[PDB]
Design a protein around this ligand. Sequence first.
Ligand SMILES: Nc1ncnc2c1ncn2[C@@H]1O[C@H](COP(=O)(O)OP(=O)(O)OP(=O)(O)O)[C@@H](O)[C@H]1O
Ligand SMILES: [Mg+2]
Lengths: 100, 118, 118, 114, 60, 49, 249, 222, 100, 35, 118
Amino acid sequence: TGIKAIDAMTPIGRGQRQLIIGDRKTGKTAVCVDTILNQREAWLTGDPKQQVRCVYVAIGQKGTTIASVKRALEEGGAMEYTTIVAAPASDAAGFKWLAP
Amino acid sequence: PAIVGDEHYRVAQEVIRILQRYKDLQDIIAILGIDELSEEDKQLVNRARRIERFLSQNMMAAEQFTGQPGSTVPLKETIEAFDKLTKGEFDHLPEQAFFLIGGLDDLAKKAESLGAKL
Amino acid sequence: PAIVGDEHYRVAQEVIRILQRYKDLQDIIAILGIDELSEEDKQLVNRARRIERFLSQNMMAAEQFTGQPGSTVPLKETIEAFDKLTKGEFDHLPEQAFFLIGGLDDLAKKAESLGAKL
Amino acid sequence: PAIVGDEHYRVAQEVIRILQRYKDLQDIIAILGIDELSEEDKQLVNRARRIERFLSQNMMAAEQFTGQPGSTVPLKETIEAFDKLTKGEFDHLPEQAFFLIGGLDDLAKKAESL
Amino acid sequence: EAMLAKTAADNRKSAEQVAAAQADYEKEMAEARAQASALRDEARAAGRSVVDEKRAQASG
Amino acid sequence: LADADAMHAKALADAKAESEKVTEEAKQDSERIAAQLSEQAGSEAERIK
Amino acid sequence: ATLRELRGRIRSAGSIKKITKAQELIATSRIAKAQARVEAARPYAAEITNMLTELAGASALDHPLLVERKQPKRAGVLVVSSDRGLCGAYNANVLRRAEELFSLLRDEGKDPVLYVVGRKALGYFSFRQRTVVESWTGFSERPTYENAREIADTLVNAFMAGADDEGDDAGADGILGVDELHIVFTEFRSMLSQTAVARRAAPMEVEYVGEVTLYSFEPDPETLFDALLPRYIATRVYAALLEAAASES
Amino acid sequence: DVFYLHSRLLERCAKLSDELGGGSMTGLPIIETKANDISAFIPTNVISITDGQCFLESDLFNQGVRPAINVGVSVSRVGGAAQIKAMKEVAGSLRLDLSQYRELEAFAAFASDLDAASKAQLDRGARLVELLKQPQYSPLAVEEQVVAIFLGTQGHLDSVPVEDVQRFESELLEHVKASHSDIFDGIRETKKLSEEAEEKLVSVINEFKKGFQASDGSSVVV
Amino acid sequence: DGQCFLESDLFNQGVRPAINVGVSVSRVGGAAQIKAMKEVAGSLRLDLSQYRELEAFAAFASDLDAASKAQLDRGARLVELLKQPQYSPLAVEEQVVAIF
Amino acid sequence: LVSVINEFKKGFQASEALDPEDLEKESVKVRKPAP
Amino acid sequence: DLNVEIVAVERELWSGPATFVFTRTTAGEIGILPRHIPLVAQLVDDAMVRVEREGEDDLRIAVDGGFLSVTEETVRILVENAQFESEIDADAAKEDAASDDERTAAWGRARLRALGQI
Ligand SMILES: Nc1ncnc2c1ncn2[C@@H]1O[C@H](COP(=O)(O)OP(=O)(O)OP(=O)(O)O)[C@@H](O)[C@H]1O
Ligand SMILES: [Mg+2]
């Protein structure tokens, strides 16, 4: 993930499911975006055994928040290997239910 | 005051105020005992303990449980006793002297039985 | 830091940290008193009380309630004032001097009115 | 006692008492160090450390990790061994000798090996 | 008597002068390291100003 | 006394020597930092464009 | 709302738990230190007691500090308390002992004179409206010999000023002294037991022990005894202060 | 069937066998709790489903602990199997160090009353807490993380003031990458910290400490 | 348009009417008062709120400062002033003089 | 009003024991016998 | 050889064998040798104690509130306070000396005498 706390105290392996749980405005999206950005060097390696393709599912977020996340990924060059599946707050309950 | 008179009402309100202050202090007391309270608060807490014990009484219908005959206290004696107790005139008597008794005469007899003197 | 700037972000984070520490210490101060805190904790508590008072402000829309005209504080003045607070540059002023005022000029005036001086 | 007998109950209760007292002293040991402890406290701490380490055992499933095979201590053997430990008949032996062993025979062999 | 007093004051002078020399050496070391740190910080600050004006120009 | 004075002089000579050495190293590090930051700023400008 | 309140109360209780446990361990360490100080003080007290015994044996037992004042009417009571308040019933016990001593003194016909060590007794007597002639504060946890010597000087001076006092007039002294000196303090018998006790320090009485090369005194036994007895009073005050500090911890 | 919803969603994240190409999908579900009540229905279900949890807390965030991960309750059931050997070595002591630090933090003002071991533990814990702090949008490569954790857990931050740790760390990492990048190379290619690399790193750290200056101005050497 | 919060705790401890000043408020404010009352009672509610805050905070301050003691004394006097028995109305002028 | 207040303020009128043996006695030891 | 013991009110300061003990009682200068007769004297207000050992330099001590007790076994020196030669600084020995206060001046003179410059 590139985050010292996670990579040292709660390491994540490939194929694991690591929940990020917390109250609002605690940095959950920050941690996930940092992980996606950290995958940049692995992507540049070019070797599929090292490369990590990223999917970011946004459920129930306002469209401008998704735009901000995409902007952050652009800044770090992460959108070259990242796909965003967006079901913003205005979407029907069907899309919010199906996006994951 | 309009119905029970000014003295009855005043004594009742003073008793309630002391008991309310004791209830408020319960939070501190539960953790730290009474030794961390100011001198005024310590005095008030001792007075409140004595008041709350003295509000108890040996009831007529309680004899079947304890074998102790009940007592009846006239209203004037009750007002006088609680006036004195709120004034601090019985601060020297032990708490148990106030427990399950009638009027001031019973308080005197029980305090004597416990070695204390009124 | 990217948008508001390094100084604004730094001062805001310091204010939030001080207020969080004060929130943590509130219960200890309530039960065991402030004397049992460490020296740095006492200093932080004084700073935090002054900071929470200074975050208060007399608003124009509130003149109908307080009967006091409102004030407007430029952002740079706010940042400088709270930077001074977080450094303890106003610890000698009574905390009441920080209540419902504008900038540092209003703070100096109120401190003069209360007998202090910055 | 009605199920496992009085001897087992007494030995287990004594072990529990010693371990609980040691746990109580753990905070003092951590903060102020073992120096502040009383002499009786130090003796109890040593005895409790040896007891808590003799509760460890070389398990059958642990062989694949540590090549040593596991042990099966009979109930009476365990009862008597922990009775002796509580009474204070092994406090002279080093602590390391109590790691991952079976009954008293293994304890003697590991003590000799040290 | 004067030779003895000399010997004494001279020994005292040497004993304090060794310490004074060590203190002065440490002081100049600290001053030079502080100057180096100030140089590094000023270089970083100038670079930050450069990137900030670059941001302003690019935004415009 | 002679030994102490000579040692003090030699210590001050070493003081200079090392002060100039560290100042030179600081100048080199400052130049390296400036070049690195300028390169990063150029990359950021490319990204902005 | 009720659950939110309960969770807040739980957080508060946890913080209080942490602080009290930390203070309890710190008090353990402080007890060790205070006991060390008491033991360190012991030898000087014992040996000076032996020297005072020798001088008293080889001198006329007529010192003003040893003679009982006829029809005494004042008592100098020194109540030793703590500056800090988280000590449980320590101050309450000391103050009950002092109050009982005051009642006994009133029965004996002496008006007590109050000297206080520690802020808690100061507050107690301030609420009780009992005037304090002079008080010391700020050294209850780790008293030094300087503090004890100052207290002993004050008490001994008050005792001396009481020799010429008749009725209520100060006499030629110009100061209305006291005819007796008492110390109320907590003796540290052991970790579980710490008992408030009142002991009279002046006028020291004499009890004779039957029997065991004699000693030589410079310049003479009388001057040595006179110069040593106040030092003994200071030593006893210091020992009491250290005992009070240990019992407070 | 809401539990079934999330469980069937999250069981599709897996590490496939080599017979199926050995590919994998790692899941990072995010859950928003209210008033930090992790016993609510959906937090309970998702916690049950997943392999580990990173609990983020507002109190830690406001304290400056960012990312605000509560390492006391955060767990990873995969654990060391998901770390490289170097990180496994340097991160071995972090758990106990931080737990002891949280035990001792009540005695922060009483370092005189603490024996040497406890005061050292408290100082090390403060250093490590500062060490785990990270700015936003700044992922660290595994080798840089290993070097930083090495600094923290090998006593190389003991001589540094607490408030400086972060800067020190960052600066030192920039120093190595600029002049001693062979350490990072070694760590990355071998995924372990060799003895020679460790000695070179210690020497580099000490020289940098010589060059470093604390915020208060005092030297950080020795 | 605002509320008067009556509390049994305040009532029992002698504060009658048992109005909890901290939470009681009027949304009309000075417009609902005559000029004299508005003049002599502009900051009364805030002053008593701050007084209650300080009193709670300074419940164990062994050594308060002069300003804090002044605030506590003034607040206690104001609290006593606001006490009022049942069936004892005051004309607005009398209230103005009392608050003065 | 303030003058009236000050005049009125000038007019205003604002309203067991120890057992002697329990008291331990410090004494000076005399190696000699009783008198 | 005889056992000397310099013991303060709080902590015993020194104890060990010695060959000679010089000091200044109120009567006059006194020198004690191993089998001196039992004696009890009072050191002068600005006394100094010089303990001559075997194979080591004389140990010089400044004493405040002194009392000498020679016994068939050992020699003891009691001090309200005492400072060794190493632990004494000339400057404060000077400003402290020549001061108005009697005890301050005596302590200064004792410190000077222990130093040697008198
Ligand atoms: N490591 C960090 N250092 C500093 N600020 C951070 C860090 N991580 C997050 N933040 C800031 O904290 C705030 C909350 O971050 P973020 O929105 O990622 O959290 P969240 O829990 O997902 O929030 P939300 O409930 O709004 O979705 C943002 O201002 C973010 O910039
Ligand atoms: Mg988010």
